[PDB]
Each structure stands twice: as C-alpha cells, then as structure tokens.
Design a protein around this ligand. Structure first.
Ligand code: BUF
Ligand code: UDP
Length: 439
C-alpha cells in the first residue's frame, strides 16, 4: 500500500528567455529543440518585435513587450520591463493547470538580473553564455590586470591563465562603439557579477575545442559545456533559393560571405570586398541585408552575376547559414567571426577568412587562425581588396589551405563526437536534464 510519484521530463516545464538578437535567439532555440526532444515541456519567451521571427523558425511560445533614448536609458527601461514581464509569466504558470509549473528559467548570460527573477519566484536559474569560454574568461578578468591600452605609444601582450598570449588586436573590441564603448564593456563584464549564485552555467561550446580554459572554469564554477546546440547533419528565409543555386555549382567552388545580422560595413569596405569577389577564381554567395544594400557600390532582394573571372555570384538579403555551410559546394567562409558563425563553421568543416568587427569577434579570429588553425585573419581600419585576395589564395589555392581544410575536418568530427551519445556535451546536457528531475 502506498503512492509512487514519478518525476519525468514530460511533466517538467523549462522556461527560456533569450536576449532579443539573432545571435542570442538562435543558439537558445536549438537548445530548446534538444530539450523538447528529451520530452521536456519548453516555453520560449521573446520580445514582441522578435516574435514573428521565432515563430517562423519553429515548443510553447510567449511574447512580452519590447520594453523600449540613449544606450543607457534604452537598457534600464528594457531591464525593468522584461523583469516584471517575465515575472508575471512565471506566476501565471505557477497557478496554471495545463502545463506544469516552471522548474527552471534559462536566461541569456547578458541579462544577469534574471537570476533574481528566477530565485525571487522560487525556481532555478540557468545562465546561457552565447560566447566561447576563452573570451568569456577575458571578461571575468576585466571585471576583476590592467586592460587599458595606449596603442599609439607601444605594443602590449597579455598573458592570462590557460590562454595563449593575446596581442592588443586579439582582445575584445569595444572602442568601435566610441561613446558607448563603456556601456558595451559593462554589459559583458556584468555577466559574472553573480556567477557564484547561478544554478547552471551553460556554454555553447565543446570541451575538446576549449579544453584548457574549460577545465580552468570547471574548477572555479562547475560550468556545463553543452555545444554546439545546433544539430549535426531552423526554417530560415530563402532556403530553397540558396540551395538550388548551390546545387548548380561545382563542389568546393563557392566562397560564402556573411557579416552576420548586426554588423554594418562602410561603403569603402563594401567596395573592396566587392572588387575582390568579382575577380577571384571562385563562385560566391554574399549575404547583404536589405538595410545594407545602399552601401554597395553604385534595392532588389537578390542579384545574379557572372564575374570578371567567368564565375557566378549571388547577392541575397538572407540565407539558411547552417545549410549553406554544410553544402558541398562551399569552399570557404568569409565571416565577421561572430561566435555562432564560428561554431557553425567548425561543426561544418568549413575554413574561414576572418574579418572581425567588434567585441568577441577579434578574439575568436585569433583562435581561428592561431589556436584551432582553421582560418586566416585579414590585416587592416580598411581591409583592401588585395588583402582579401591574399587570404582567398591562401585558404583556397594553397598547400597551407589544404591543411587548414584538414584541420577543419578534424574539428568537425570532434564537435560531432561531443554532441553524440557519451560525448562531453551530450553528457553535460544530460546532467542538466536529469538533475532537473531530482527531489
Ligand atoms: C548586446 C550586443 C550583441 C551581443 C553582444 O553582447 C554585443 C552587444 C553589442 C552592443 C549591442 C548588441 C545588441 C544590439 C544593440 C542593442 C543595438 C542597438 C544600438 C543602439 C540602440 O539604440 O539600440 C540598439 C546595436 C548593437 C547593440 O547596442
Ligand atoms: O544569412 C544569414 C546570416 C546569419 N545567420 C545566423 O545568424 C546567427 C547569429 O550570427 P553570429 O553569432 O555569427 O553574429 P551576429 O549576427 O550576432 O553579429 C547564426 O545562427 C547564423 O546562422 C543566418 O541564419 N543567415
């Protein structure tokens, strides 16, 4: 005689709340996909202005007001609005009868105040970092070593535990934001203000990729490396168009070019890249967002070209990046080195030409070229066509490039192993799921 009680994923409710930008939404969506496939009930909370985006990419979906002035006011409003918004949702779900009450809130690492919403309403908090471990620990040391730089007087090289030496150009780039550099800096530093009170510290990376620094952070804070959250081999826009075009190219013949969802290049920088791509011995697929089309050399959603070299080019406002990168036609990836684009390239075996723009993109580029050895970084600040030309020859037409390709194929296998049964990332994500079930 008695009652047995069963705690299983299908009666466990996970809340997820990304920062409303595609580089933060996308990795969180993939993680929600993996968690739902384990049987969990997953509710994704997102701002109204990103809601339609996420709806088209798909899991229960909740919208909250955008919550929005200069950078500082814009952001204090944002933090205040989403605090009460998300708190309301937790409480509606705690009294609801359909879904189970929330057990945990997975929130973006850049919204650390959400840990206080989670704990203030009696549920657990998991902080999802969308940056690699290596650059993240740079933010921690900065929050805690002199990082000022009078780059005009002398060159400095910084040594930190479990990191390669970092030149000034390898540190995170904040001066780009000029007046707002301090704001962007504090946003990334403050990720660590409560690192000791977080119930789960989640990183979208895999241990073999960052083993030295992952271990150092595992010792300090017991982090969980659970990446890549994207699947091995999201409904994005223009899928059929780009897949048909790529299906019509020769294998290993296409340079894929994209600077992500936020970065905006000067008109002179666009002219340089343009002139390189139209004279290279390769086809190209170049994503230029609608908002950036007017900065192209003197607006249609896409344009087709026969290049001066007799090759074929496609300029298009958006593509399915993961599908593009895994297409056999792609020879290499000219990228701003956002972490999602970097980790997607790694998981796809595609070598890179690094054109980093700001924040962690400079550090990622350093690791792409000198640590993982799967790409080369351009040298500035304007990057001229001849410099872009040099990097294409090196990646795509050289013995060194064949080696870079070999290195990328190795890392592709290692990230597949990480997310497969018994891999470090599969194990860490199962640690997260299983301990959510504990009494
Ligand atoms: C958070 C952010 C992306 C991820 C990483 O932490 C680096 C950050 C860079 C700065 C921040 C971006 C996000 C968009 C901005 C708010 C967006 C912006 C700028 C001005 C404004 O009024 O509203 C939004 C453009 C860039 C942005 O300011
Ligand atoms: O044409 C494109 C360009 C980018 N992305 C996606 O945009 C996301 C985030 O980009 P990233 O982190 O590299 O840099 P950001 O856009 O934040 O600057 C990635 O998941 C990419 O797959 C896409 O789907 N199609």
């Amino acid at each position: 005689m008695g009652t047995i009680e069963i705690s299983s994923p299908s009666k466990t409710h996970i809340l997820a709340f990304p920062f409303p930008e595609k580089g933060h939404i996308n990795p969180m969506l993939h993680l929600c996909n993996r968690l739902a496939s384990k049987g969990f009930r997953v509710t994704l909370i997102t701002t109204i202005s990103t809601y339609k985006d996420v709806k088209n990419k798909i899991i229960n979906l909740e919208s909250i007001p955008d919550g929005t002035l200069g950078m500082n006011g814009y952001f204090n409003q944002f933090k205040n609005s989403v605090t009460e918004s998300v708190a309301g949702i937790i409480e509606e779900y705690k009294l609801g009868h359909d879904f189970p009450p929330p057990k945990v809130l997975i929130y973006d690492s850049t919204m650390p105040w959400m840990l206080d919403v989670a704990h203030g309403h009696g549920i657990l908090g998991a902080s999802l970092f969308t940056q690699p471990c290596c650059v993240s620990v740079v933010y921690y040391h900065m929050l805690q070593i002199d990082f000022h730089r009078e780059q005009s007087s002398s060159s400095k090289v910084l040594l930190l535990p479990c990191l390669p030496p970092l030149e000034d150009r390898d540190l995170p780039e904040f001066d780009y934001f000029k007046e707002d550099s301090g704001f962007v800096s504090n946003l990334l530093l403050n990720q660590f203000l409560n690192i000791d009170k977080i119930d789960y510290v989640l990183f979208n990376t895999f241990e073999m990729l960052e083993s030295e620094i992952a271990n150092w952070m595992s010792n300090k804070w017991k982090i969980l490396t659970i990446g890549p959250t994207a699947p091995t081999a999201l409904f994005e826009t223009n899928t059929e168009v780009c897949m048909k075009w790529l299906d019509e190219r020769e294998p290993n013949s296409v340079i894929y070019v994209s600077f992500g969802s936020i970065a905006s290049l000067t008109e002179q920088q666009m002219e340089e890249i343009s002139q390189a791509l139209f004279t290279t011995n390769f086809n190209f697929l170049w994503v230029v967002r609608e908002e950036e089309r007017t900065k192209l050399p003197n607006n249609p959603s896409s344009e087709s070209f026969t290049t001066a070299a007799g090759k074929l080019g496609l300029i298009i406002n958006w593509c399915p990046q993961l599908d593009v990168l895994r297409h056999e036609s792609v020879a290499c990836f000219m990228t701003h080195c956002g972490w999602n684009s970097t980790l997607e390239a790694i998981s796809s075996g595609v070598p890179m030409i690094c054109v980093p723009q700001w924040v962690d993109q400079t550090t990622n580029a350093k690791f792409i070229q000198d640590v993982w050895k799967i790409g080369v970084r351009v040298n500035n600040g304007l990057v001229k066509k001849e410099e872009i030309e040099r990097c294409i020859k090196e990646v795509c037409e050289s013995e060194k490039g064949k080696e870079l390709k070999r290195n990328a194929m190795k890392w592709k296998d290692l990230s597949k192993e990480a997310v497969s049964e018994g891999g470090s990332s599969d194990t860490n994500l199962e640690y997260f799921a299983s301990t959510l079930l504990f009494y």
